[PDB]
Design a protein around this ligand. Sequence first.
Ligand SMILES: [Mg+2]
Ligand SMILES: [Mg+2]
Length: 64
Amino acid sequence: GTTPGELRELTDDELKDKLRESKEELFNLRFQMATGQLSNNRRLRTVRQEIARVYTVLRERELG
RNA sequence: AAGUGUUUAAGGGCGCAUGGUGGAUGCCUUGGCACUGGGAGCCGAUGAAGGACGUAGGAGGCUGCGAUAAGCCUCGGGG
Ligand SMILES: [Mg+2]
Ligand SMILES: [Mg+2]
């Protein structure tokens, strides 16, 4: 979704913000496709991408 | 008057020519068997071997995967 060049140089409050918005987008998109109004898959995949990498970066900077 | 004498096939048998089931035979392998030369010779509470369930816009099965569910990141080969 967004480049690691920006992602690694951006800060704690902002990855918290994209964390909450990405959970919110997972919520919305998964359940419009659940309702049956949505068509394609790559949206859930890329929001999955975002949540996975933000959680990884969270624990990375927590440990380091 | 007289005696002499083939003449039919319900079916059947035998050959001939055509067919019908049944898939041996000939030719093949994506499969198995037995060895040679090397590598690794263990896997698990930082949770194994094997499973259940789920996961695809689609109804099931194989395979991959695990509410982040036929996958994701960073790194490099390829078009
Ligand atoms: Mg399966
Ligand atoms: Mg590369």
